[PDB]
Design a protein around this ligand. Structure first.
Ligand code: HEM
Length: 185
């Protein structure tokens, strides 16, 4: 994962559970206590999993809920970096463009494997969206949907339809229902 993102996640872990919890977990993975996470460096996905695991211990909270909260909080940070993706958009159109955005933002990186996030309308007030990735970050994905609903102030309900791994690709399909209709007739 790009260090940009991992560093963002660490700050949220710090902001949520405290410098003590985080600093102890960054040492159990061998990180120097003075490490500066540059943008372009790529941090190993399993090192991040270890970090999140230690924080789950040192807090008693389930690591899925930690990932969910990190997801909810990350949307705000993305609006700081990419305000054009948020400007003038409604929630449903933001969600439907995420698949394309993740392609556009990784296509200059050799060997990038961005998650697929295809969304399609299934009713006047609902869409389906399917996460597809080697990385199996189900709760991060769910948390980002929830954070998007809070950012845009459009309430939704999320129904999980299917989850599972095929080969190495994890897949999670959800049905997102908007409390008000989002389509026109
Ligand atoms: C403007 C908002 C957003 C931006 C700019 C953005 C961008 C990115 C980028 C560049 C990555 C790294 C991909 C890679 O390294 O392969 C990523 C990771 C990820 N993105 Fe987003 N994202 C946004 C919102 C969302 C939303 C709304 C969702 C879900 C609906 C989502 C789902 C994910 C997941 C689950 C990952 C982790 C990688 C994985 O599971 O394979 N993102 N995001």
């Amino acid at each position: 994962m790009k260090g940009t993102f991992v560093g963002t996640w660490i700050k949220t872990l710090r902001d949520l559970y405290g410098n003590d919890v985080v600093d102890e977990s960054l040492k159990s993975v061998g990180w120097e206590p003075d490490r500066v996470i540059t943008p372009l460096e790529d941090i190993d996905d399993d090192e991040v999993r270890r970090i999140f695991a230690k924080v789950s211990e040192k807090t008693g909270k389930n690591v899925n809920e930690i990932w969910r909260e990190v997801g909810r909080q990350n949307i705000k940070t993305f609006s700081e970096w990419f305000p054009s993706y948020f400007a003038g958009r409604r929630l449903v159109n933001f969600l439907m463009m995420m698949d394309e955005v993740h392609l556009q933002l990784t296509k200059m990186i050799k060997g990038a494997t961005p998650p697929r996030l295809i969304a399609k309308p299934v009713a006047k007030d609902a869409i389906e969206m399917e996460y597809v990735s080697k990385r199996k970050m189900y709760d991060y994905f769910l948390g980002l949907i929830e954070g998007s609903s809070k950012f845009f102030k459009e309430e939704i309900s999320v129904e999980e339809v299917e989850r599972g791994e095929k080969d190495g690709f994890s897949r999670l399909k959800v049905r997102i229902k908007f409390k008000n209709p989002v389509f026109e007739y």
